[PDB]
Amino acid sequence: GTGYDLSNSVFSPDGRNFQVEYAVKAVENGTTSIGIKCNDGVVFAVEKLITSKLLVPQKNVKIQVVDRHIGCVYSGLIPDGRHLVNRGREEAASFKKLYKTPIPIPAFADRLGQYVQAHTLYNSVRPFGVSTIFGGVDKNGAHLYMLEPSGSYWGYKGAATGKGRQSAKAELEKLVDHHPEGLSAREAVKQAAKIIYLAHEDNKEKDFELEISWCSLSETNGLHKFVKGDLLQEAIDFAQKEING
Amino acid sequence: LKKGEVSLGTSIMAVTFKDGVILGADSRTTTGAYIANRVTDKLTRVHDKIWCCRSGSAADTQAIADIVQYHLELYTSQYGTPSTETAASVFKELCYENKDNLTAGIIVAGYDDKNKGEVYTIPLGGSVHKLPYAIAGSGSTFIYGYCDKNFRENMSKEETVDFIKHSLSQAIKWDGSSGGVIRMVVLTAAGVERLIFYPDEYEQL
Amino acid sequence: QFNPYGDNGGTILGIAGEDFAVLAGDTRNITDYSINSRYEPKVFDCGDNIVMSANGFAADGDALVKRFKNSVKWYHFDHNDKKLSINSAARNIQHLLYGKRFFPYYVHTIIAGLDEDGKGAVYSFDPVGSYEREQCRAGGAAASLIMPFLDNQVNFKNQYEPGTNGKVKKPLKYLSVEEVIKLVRDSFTSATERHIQVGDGLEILIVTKDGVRKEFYELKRD
Amino acid sequence: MDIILGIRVQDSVILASSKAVTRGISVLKDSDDKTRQLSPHTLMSFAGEAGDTVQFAEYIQANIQLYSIREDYELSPQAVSSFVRQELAKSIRSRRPYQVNVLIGGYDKKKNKPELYQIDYLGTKVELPYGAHGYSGFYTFSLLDHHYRPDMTTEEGLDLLKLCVQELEKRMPMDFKGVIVKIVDKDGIRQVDDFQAQ
Amino acid sequence: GYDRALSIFSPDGHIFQVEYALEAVKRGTCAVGVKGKNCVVLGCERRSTLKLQDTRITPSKVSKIDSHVVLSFSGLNADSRILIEKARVEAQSHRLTLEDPVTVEYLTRYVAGVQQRYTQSGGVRPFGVSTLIAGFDPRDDEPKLYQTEPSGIYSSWSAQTIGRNSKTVREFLEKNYDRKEPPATVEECVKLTVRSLLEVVQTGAKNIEITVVKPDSDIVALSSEEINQYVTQIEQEKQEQQ
Amino acid sequence: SDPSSINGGIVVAMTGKDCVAIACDLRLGSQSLGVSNKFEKIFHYGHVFLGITGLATDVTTLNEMFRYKTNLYKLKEERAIEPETFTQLVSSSLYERRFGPYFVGPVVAGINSKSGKPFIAGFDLIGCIDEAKDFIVSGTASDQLFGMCESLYEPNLEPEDLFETISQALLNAADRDALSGWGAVVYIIKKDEVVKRYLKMRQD
Amino acid sequence: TTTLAFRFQGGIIVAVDSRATAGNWVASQTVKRVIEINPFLLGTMAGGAADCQFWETWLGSQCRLHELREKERISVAAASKILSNLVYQYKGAGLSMGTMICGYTRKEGPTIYYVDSDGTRLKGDIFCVGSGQTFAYGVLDSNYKWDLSVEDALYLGKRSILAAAHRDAYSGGSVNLYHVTEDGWIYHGNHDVGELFWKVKEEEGSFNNVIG
Amino acid sequence: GSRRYDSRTTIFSPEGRLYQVEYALESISHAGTAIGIMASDGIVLAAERKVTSTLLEQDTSTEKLYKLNDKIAVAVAGLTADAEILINTARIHAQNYLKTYNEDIPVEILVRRLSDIKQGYTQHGGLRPFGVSFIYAGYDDRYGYQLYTSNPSGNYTGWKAISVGANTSAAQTLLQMDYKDDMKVDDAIELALKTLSKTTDSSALTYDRLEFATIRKGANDGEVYQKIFKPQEIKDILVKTGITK
Amino acid sequence: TQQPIVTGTSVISMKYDNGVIIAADNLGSYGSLLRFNGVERLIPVGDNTVVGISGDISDMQHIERLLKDLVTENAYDNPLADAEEALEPSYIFEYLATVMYQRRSKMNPLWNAIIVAGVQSNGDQFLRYVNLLGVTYSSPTLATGFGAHMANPLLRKVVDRESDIPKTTVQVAEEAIVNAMRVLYYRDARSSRNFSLAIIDKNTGLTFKKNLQVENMKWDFAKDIKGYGTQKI
């Protein structure tokens, strides 16, 4: 109640308005998503919480495509995530029509990024409050990026977020360190499943449904695909192995 | 409505060689039968490693190219270095929506260090076409046989330098709206090298 | 600069009856001396017991009928699913037409159905709009050939029994659908002989109080 | 056209305006006031297309009448004329021009002198003792310059106008069936219901 | 911003802006209209103790909307001018499109809509003036007197008073004029109006301004002199009980 | 129809010595029938005189516009409008309307209130400024007018003799027209009196 | 197409032709030619089909609105002028309208206004519109008489139409007669030209004074 | 929030007039005086110049006296800034009227446009009103001399002598007493110069601390000739009255 | 408007009982100069529809971009639906048809003639036409530009009617398309030698053969040897 909590038509004494700070805090009590960068691709995984037997398995999906080769998953407030993506699409299509090429990940990042920054310089236009793990492959490699509430983004090589962040990040850095970057795309699927399974240990008063995807240069042939069938059964096997089972 | 109209040297090319592309042109503007320009710079940088040859109407090509220049500067700073194919689309878009006033025959040729040298040829009305080499203008039909037969990939710089000087010097002779200097542009990763040879030189050589 | 709009053939024929109405149309779609289709009708049942054909140039036709179908949909939505009458439909189709009098347009539209009394109605349009109801009405390429015959055998105007042909007359026939299809059948068969805008197939839509019924007769092919 | 004459006598403006519209063989309408009263000492007479006339007339009367009440006095012939011309000059640039060319016969009631104005459909403004529209003036300017000289009572104006109209109907091939005469002075607008030698 | 909450209901159902509007009216001058049945009289107060001004540079109380339509007001000067400009545009537009000299009621419908308009919807604030619009509709021997408010309501009324000393003049109209049987004479209608505004102005005939409108454009505003002779007469009727 | 020669018109300006002269016709026609011998084309703004030839509608519209511009300029500045300045404002108002209609040939004459020296300038519908201190002519018969003036004028003329040059130049130029008859006026302008003299001349 | 309307003691006589053609062969003897806006206004068809149709229902919306809202009988005087003013807006938009705006209100009596796409609005006793109009005008004019009975007025109207029918081939399928009164219009039947020709040619003796 | 950072003061007081408008009136009464005297052979305007010192240019006294027309001029009481915006619009309104009807604007007609905008300024936008009152000096050929006043309340009246700005009561009281209708320009000036003296308390009053203009019939016009006095002309008339103050 | 300067010539198609065949040359012509050899003009959209565009290459490039948006947007919202409610021929067809009608109606038409050929995974085989003139049709043979005139009658002996479709088969159909292409390179010199051929079976999905070359040659010139340029003194 200072006008640094009711308006963003000013600069704050903390260099940010309170409501943007609050967006960052609400990502963390949320749902877990990770992103694994590897030497030929990226892998995405997200924990989908099960609260009832009334939900249907994989007919609600959280990982949504932009283009055909960039995969987007996000954690945090559901409505804000729809709106971010809808925008993400309009940029992506405009790029494909106008330059006659699929869009680069550092390019795509600058376009969403500038739009998250816009909604954070007006006194009555809502901030975003999702952290988006996104990425894909283009004509000079694979890239993993993570976008925050505040409009903050950098390239990542491993990324983690959510309730189970602490655990997740621990396993994830160990494995990334051990590996040249993450080893094969294939190996990374199983690994990814272990992190999500391990993070689920931080919330056993609910169930999960493991959901993975990938986007890999020679291991999806440039496309983003959902991870399913055998490839999903195998990652499950590996996961229940280490975390006892 | 433009009163009078303008024309360029109409035998333009981009040739692939050992380490990139060498881009070659004749230059001459005439306004009717008045020789508006002996020499011209129609050897146009649209980015630091991606140049083009402009042909067609002087007023129109220059007006387009400036717009392409603005998009590809902004494009570099934000979204990373262009490609030959990226430049080519921007040129095309501007021609197609305004093909009601525009006459632009464009070769955009640029060097990338993971595609090697690239030639994209955008005729009148505007459509992107990828080819491993190009000849354009209206004098190109007449050298189609030469060009196809002596076109060879990975030819020595000395040999390509002769080949372009010769290719044009023959074209310029038999065609009539061609004339003025032959200027050439070597694009490799070491940078951009500029060649100019005057009339008295090339005819002879 | 370009006008892509020209005209293409096809022939329709609408007859209003006591208790029924027909809208009959050929299946041949042509542009010049080529066959575009042998089976494609320009007549559609647009619903609420309203049948429609906007005969002439195809490009204009397809678009007017897409426009009329959405408009029918929204009426229903906003007005408690109310029946679209032949009177309502008619007015609407004019507003669409006059909306595009500014641009070239080229259909002779004819709508048939039933009004809420249970009485046939056939309404004819110009490509700019205006309508009025007629007792029999030929439209399309062979309109001009079909109508002189149609006036004698349906309307009994210019048709007189022997004795004086002027005091002795043949009266207007009390309509019944079965005899009317014989009349339609005869018209269309005489038309294939004279016109290359008619043939392939004849589709008769009959609109009754038992619903909309489709009747099918073959026409000339090689 | 529509034959429209004017003559300014020493106290008044007498304006003569056709009484008929003739369609081939017969007069289709023959009760034609081709003039509209703006105000009780502003009259404007008209020639041009039939449709422009009434559409302009009604638009213009309404504007002037709005000015009369807002400012709480009757607008001068001078005030109306400058207004009339300025609207006509704009219309020419636009898709549809008002194609009426006019004669405004007024009493300047504030300084006590009659004034007659010819304003064209483009905007060509002139003050005149007498004037005419079209081919009329070739024949009738020849009678008015010769037989008339200023400072002649009102009745002499009536007889001159009839002689002008007779010569027009005889020698020029247009057909307009005489004139219906109206007089604008301080007593207002009066109809001369004779045209027999007046 | 300013496109919202100028005007909203209370939970008590009063409107702020309308409630403070009616207060400008009580404070301002006094206008009254009494109808005959072949005349309408409009009497007006204009109240100034400062004597260093003329009537011919101080605006009139009765303004012409048309020769046969008149408007009287009580309230702010500023606001009333806005309303007057619309009514003249509406008179001339009606005459143009329907080709009928104006009906007085339609004109009330236009002035009243504007008044409703700035209250219901934001981006403008409401008016603080109430009006009397009166006149004769063509082909009528029957007088018309209307009242329109900042609310934007209107209704037709046999005599009506607004402004300072509404109570006093009200009582007088209740006990000396009837809806049933009004003055039938022009003279008696004049006498009554003077009687009513004299009790309240607290001056002679030099601060009451009477204007009488007889049918279809026949308007004569009696002068200070003419009113005084009735003012004399009135002091005589009152000295039968004194 | 005609684009400006419905009613025609001609205008002549001379420089004298402390003095300038501007003269014009007084014709109004409807095509070739001359209708009136009176219609003034010369108006002035402060002390700078503006004659405008052309179509009558276009003289009227410009005259009202130049009133509007001079008055607000006059009001802000507490100072009148100056020949030198006036030339530029005319150019700038005319170039905006080269895309609009206009079929005019204005001529400006004056004596500066800021160096005491004679000033004339000429304009076409194109808006080519004609910088001159000898004579400048405009109108339908401008070609002929240039020949008459080039021969007849002699430098450094006082109002009476200046008067004789202009009056005769205009009369004999006009005699080979009919679109320059119906009376004509000469104004001989000093910065302290203006003499207006009607001439007697042809008509059809 | 030839349509006429004349003002007389009993109200208004409106008489019209009907004819639709495929060639010169009469395809139908039928088609409207009075557009009944509401029972108090008629507008007669002699313009473009679509133009007349569109603006005259739209005119029906302005009449209905004026009476519903303002609780006042709308004039013929108001009906024509609403129409003329819109017409001038759609002028040089491709408009073709020739209509006569007919009504008989309490406040004006029988009133006939001629309204065209030029936007002209004229009041008159007598207006004939068409292209057989000059000939139709002849018959009417030489037998014109304001003080006339409704029945005899109908016979004069119908002979006038016939006259125009015989010479001009854009009329003459059938005649529809209507007499427009205060309280609304009364239809006077549909008369066949065949039967009507032989009676008149013998009966009238105008252009037939020695039978031809 | 910022929908409650609205001042909400361009709405009515219960006092029958807007907050901001009433408060603004005070502002006028704390800035320079204008006095308007309408005479039977002129109109005399006097205004006392607010700050006069050597650091100022003292030879300028058009700082509040502007002529809007050839025969209309105004006097300002209020602040320079507030004034300028209405001056410019009145000037144009003069030119629109001139152009449409071929005649000069009547004094009340001109007054009425200015007053409808002053009201407007609070009626549309919520913005603040002016801080200026004018006393208008003009001639029209339909009523003789007219001398009017308008205030940011949009109420206007005509008067035969009025004062606005500071010390309205004192000056008005004296004016009503000495007023006559057989006064001449010179009799008015003398009168004006007495009144001004009695409201200013000094050792002496100087000619450069005044701004003066009169609009008289003249002897170069049957119209009215507007004479704008400058310090040195103020000095002369001070001798002529023999009223040193 | 939009006028020839770069042209593609001829797209042919016909239906057989279990599927459809479509074949079209690979051509960017510059009048009678065969400037670009390789230019795509069959776009597979999804995995059960192929768009064949004839006419101006500049404009085809405009449809190409719209299609690139149609593949992304039908995967948008639901990448769970790809053959159920994404990318049917009937949906591709109506998407194209809306741009076509809109561009012509404002009197600056796109200059193409289009066949969207497909086999519905949810229905029956799909063969429907749209051109710049706005003429639209379905028929068991559809062909664009020059092909409309000549190729189409040869296709039409196989199927021209609803009854003939069950009597047509892969072998008959495939021979007929090649026979048709052979006729086009033979009587028209614009249409290229190098072509691509796609057979779309409902059960076996989309099969796209790239780089077929017109074969079963005609070496007609050896008959007319009389000399043509050796001129004797």
For domain H1-244, the CATH superfamily is Aminohydrolase, N-terminal nucleophile (Ntn) domain (3.60.20.10)
Taking an 8 Å cut-off on Cβ atoms, the answer to whether I79 and A61 are in contact is yes
Taking an 8 Å cut-off on Cβ atoms, the answer to whether C94 and G30 are in contact is no
Burial B150-184 (b: 16+ CB within 10 A, else e): eeeeebeeeebbebbbebbbebbeebebbbbbbbb
Active site residue A31: yes
| DSSP letters spanning F78-111 | TS---HHHHHHHHHHHHHTTSSS---B--EEEEE
CA distance G170 to chain D (A): 20
Establish if D141 touches chain H: CB-CB under 8 angstroms.
Answer: no
Cβ neighbors of F88 (< 8 A, separation 6 or more) are: none
Cβ-Cβ contacts under 8 Å, G81 against chain E: 96-99
CA distance H146 to chain E (A): 7
Taking an 8 Å cut-off on Cβ atoms, the answer to whether A106 and B83 are in contact is no
Cβ-Cβ contacts under 8 Å, I136 against chain C: 58-59, 62
Please check whether residue B79 is in contact with residue B107, taking contact to mean a CB–CB distance below 8 angstroms: no
Distances (CA, A) of C66 to H184, I98, I100: 86, 11, 14
The single-letter DSSP state of residue B7 is B
Count the Cβ atoms, other than its own, within 10 Å of residue C176. 11
Cβ-Cβ contacts under 8 Å, D95 against chain G: 92
Angle CA(A218)–CA(A221)–CA(A223) in degrees, nearest 5?
125
* Chain E, nearest residue to D65 by Cα: E92
In chain D, which ranges are continuous DSSP H helix?
Answer: 50-71, 77-91, 136-147, 154-171
Nearest to F52 by CA among F41, F66, F67: F41
Neighbors of chain D by Cβ distance (3+ pairs < 8 Å): E, F, G, H
Strand partners, A91: none
Best of I32, I61, I68 to substitute, by most chain B Cβ atoms within 10 angstroms, is I61
Please check whether residue H33 is in contact with residue H175, taking contact to mean a CB–CB distance below 8 angstroms: no
Where do the structural domains in chain B lie, given as residue ranges?
Answer: 7-205
Taking an 8 Å cut-off on Cβ atoms, the answer to whether C151 and G28 are in contact is yes
Cβ neighbors of H184 (< 8 A, separation 6 or more) are: H39, H40, H41, H42
Amino acid at F41: K
Token pair of G107 as six digits? 């406040």
Cβ-Cβ contacts under 8 Å, D31 against chain G: 124
Q: Strand, coil or helix: what is A79?
A: helix
In whole angstroms, give the CA distance from residue I38 to residue I41. Answer: 9
Taking an 8 Å cut-off on Cβ atoms, the answer to whether G75 and E103 are in contact is no
* Chain H, nearest residue to A124 by Cα: H2
Strand partners, B184: B24, B195
* Chain E, nearest residue to G85 by Cα: E97
A window 205-234, beta carbon within 8 A of I: 226
Token pair of C88 as six digits? 């309502």
H214-218: long-range contacts (C-beta < 8 A, 24 or more apart)?
H214/H42, H214/H43, H214/H44, H214/H45, H214/H185, H214/H188, H214/H189, H215/H42, H215/H43, H215/H45, H215/H71, H215/H73, H215/H137, H215/H138, H215/H139, H216/H41, H216/H42, H216/H185, H217/H41, H217/H42
Please check whether residue H130 is in contact with residue H154, taking contact to mean a CB–CB distance below 8 angstroms: no
Distances (CA, A) of H48 to D64, F46, H55, H160, H199: 44, 32, 18, 20, 10
Domains of chain A: 2-244 (3.60.20.10)
Q: Phi and psi at residue G77, in whole multiples of 5°?
A: -60, -40
Token pair of F114 as six digits? 């800021």
In chain B, which ranges are continuous DSSP H helix?
Answer: 58-79, 84-97, 144-150, 157-174, 199-202
Taking an 8 Å cut-off on Cβ atoms, the answer to whether E106 and G66 are in contact is no
Distances (CA, A) of B100 to E95, I97, I111: 51, 24, 14
Distances (CA, A) of B33 to B28, B29, B30, B182, G133: 12, 10, 6, 20, 66
Taking an 8 Å cut-off on Cβ atoms, the answer to whether H91 and F68 are in contact is no
CA distance G160 to chain E (A): 34
Taking an 8 Å cut-off on Cβ atoms, the answer to whether C59 and I138 are in contact is no
CA distance D157 to chain F (A): 19
Where do the structural domains in chain H lie, given as residue ranges?
Answer: 1-244
Taking an 8 Å cut-off on Cβ atoms, the answer to whether G81 and E103 are in contact is no
In whole angstroms, give the CA distance from residue G180 to residue G34. Answer: 11
Taking an 8 Å cut-off on Cβ atoms, the answer to whether G50 and C151 are in contact is no
F window 51-90, beta carbon within 8 A of H: 64, 67-68, 71-72, 75, 78
Count the Cβ atoms, other than its own, within 10 Å of residue B191. 10
In whole angstroms, give the CA distance from residue H120 to residue H128. Answer: 10
Q: Is C10 left (phi over 0), alpha (psi -120 to 50) or beta?
A: left
Q: Strand, coil or helix: what is D13?
A: strand
* Of residues I33, I39, I62, nearest to B129 (C-beta): I39
Intra-chain end-to-end CA distance of chain B, in Å:
43
Token pair of F93 as six digits? 């108002």
Best of D83, D87, D127 to substitute, by most chain H Cβ atoms within 10 angstroms, is D83
* Of residues B124, B126, B141, nearest to I33 (C-beta): B141
Token pair of E87 as six digits? 């009514």
CATH of E1-240, one of 3.20.20.450, 3.60.20.10, 3.40.50.300, 3.40.50.720: 3.60.20.10
Angle CA(A224)–CA(A227)–CA(A232) in degrees, nearest 5?
165
Cβ-Cβ contacts under 8 Å, C31 against chain I: 133, 135
* Of residues I109, I148, I161, nearest to C4 (C-beta): I109
Catalytic residue among A31, A120, A132, A220: A31
Strand partners, G13: G6, G179
Cβ-Cβ contacts under 8 Å, B126 against chain A: none
* Of residues F68, F75, F78, nearest to H99 (C-beta): F68
Cβ-Cβ contacts under 8 Å, I62 against chain B: 96
- Give the method used: cryo-EM
* Chain I, nearest residue to A93 by Cα: I69
Three-state helix/strand/coil letters over chain C: CCCCCCCCCCEEEEEECCCCEEEEEECCEEECCEEEECCCCCEEECCCCEEEEEEECHHHHHHHHHHHHHHHHHHHHHCCCCCCCHHHHHHHHHHHHHCCCCCCCCEEEEEEEECCCCCEEEEEECCCCCEEECCEEEEECCHHHHHHHHHHHHHCCCCCCCCCCCCCCCCCCCCCHHHHHHHHHHHHHHHHHHCCCCCCEEEEEEEECCEEEEEEEECCCC
Amino acid at B118: E
In whole angstroms, give the CA distance from residue H42 to residue H26. Answer: 31
Distances (CA, A) of E72 to E143, E189, F15, F120: 15, 18, 64, 59
Q: Phi and psi at residue G36, in whole multiples of 5°?
A: -95, 95
CA distance B90 to chain A (A): 6
Where do the structural domains in chain D lie, given as residue ranges?
Answer: 1-195
* Chain I, nearest residue to A226 by Cα: I79
In whole angstroms, give the CA distance from residue C186 to residue C197. Answer: 16
Strand order in the sheet with I141-143: I141-143, I11-16, I19-25, I194-201, I205-213
Taking an 8 Å cut-off on Cβ atoms, the answer to whether D75 and H101 are in contact is yes
Token pair of I148 as six digits? 């409309």
In whole angstroms, give the CA distance from residue A75 to residue A81. Answer: 8
Cβ-Cβ contacts under 8 Å, D54 against chain G: 84, 119-121
Taking an 8 Å cut-off on Cβ atoms, the answer to whether C62 and I136 are in contact is yes
Taking an 8 Å cut-off on Cβ atoms, the answer to whether E96 and D70 are in contact is no
Q: Does domain D1-195 have CATH number 3.60.20.10?
A: yes
As a dihedral over the C-alpha atoms of residue E155, residue E158, residue E164, residue E169, rounded to 10 degrees, the angle is -150
Token pair of G134 as six digits? 């000059």
| DSSP letters spanning chain E | --SSSSS-B-SS--BHHHHHHHHHHHHS-EEEEEE-SS-EEEEEE---S--S--SSSSPPSSEEEETTEEEEEEE-HHHHHHHHHHHHHHHHHHHHHH-SPPPHHHHHHHHHHHHHHHHHSSSSPPP-EEEEEEE--SS--S-EEEEE-SS--EEE-SEEEEESSHHHHHHHHHHH--SSS---SHHHHHHHHHHHHHHHH-S-TTSEEEEEEETTTEEEPPPHHHHHHHHHHHHHHGGG--
Total count of residues recorded for chain G: 212
* Chain A, nearest residue to I70 by Cα: A93
Amino acid at H50: K
Domain of residue F60, CATH code: 3.60.20.10
In whole angstroms, give the CA distance from residue F79 to residue F62. Answer: 22
Taking an 8 Å cut-off on Cβ atoms, the answer to whether E57 and H108 are in contact is yes
- Tell me the pairing of strands I49-56 and I112-119: antiparallel
In whole angstroms, give the CA distance from residue B49 to residue B189. Answer: 8
* Chain H, nearest residue to D83 by Cα: H100
Amino acid at G90: Y
Token pair of A176 as six digits? 């990334």
CATH of B7-205, one of 3.40.50.300, 3.40.30.10, 3.60.20.10, 3.40.718.10: 3.60.20.10
Cβ neighbors of F135 (< 8 A, separation 6 or more) are: F12, F13, F14, F15, F120, F149, F153
Q: Which CATH class is domain C1-222?
A: alpha beta
Best of E99, E103, E140, E144 to substitute, by most chain G Cβ atoms within 10 angstroms, is E99
In whole angstroms, give the CA distance from residue F121 to residue F103. Answer: 18
G20 is an annotated ligand-binding site residue: no
Nearest to E43 by CA among E217, E226, E241, E232: E226
Q: Do chains G and D touch (3 or more CB pairs under 8 A)?
A: yes
Cβ neighbors of E3 (< 8 A, separation 6 or more) are: E122, E123
Establish if F64 touches chain D: CB-CB under 8 angstroms.
Answer: yes
Cβ-Cβ contacts under 8 Å, D63 against chain E: 92
Domains of chain I: 1-233 (3.60.20.10)
In chain F, which ranges are continuous DSSP H helix?
Answer: 56-77, 83-95, 142-152, 159-174
Count the Cβ atoms, other than its own, within 10 Å of residue B77. 8
Please check whether residue C35 is in contact with residue C134, taking contact to mean a CB–CB distance below 8 angstroms: no
In whole angstroms, give the CA distance from residue H111 to residue H113. Answer: 6
Q: How many structural domains comprise chain F? A: 1
Q: Which helix (H) or strand (E) holds H110?
A: helix H107-123
* Of residues E20, E54, E76, nearest to H155 (C-beta): E76
Cβ-Cβ contacts under 8 Å, H99 against chain D: 86
Neighbors of chain A by Cβ distance (3+ pairs < 8 Å): B, H, I
In whole angstroms, give the CA distance from residue D48 to residue F142. Answer: 34
Taking an 8 Å cut-off on Cβ atoms, the answer to whether C36 and I109 are in contact is no
In whole angstroms, give the CA distance from residue C149 to residue C158. Answer: 10
Please check whether residue A172 is in contact with residue A34, taking contact to mean a CB–CB distance below 8 angstroms: yes
Q: Which residue has the tokens 């929506």?
A: B97
Nearest to G144 by CA among G14, G24, G7, G36: G7
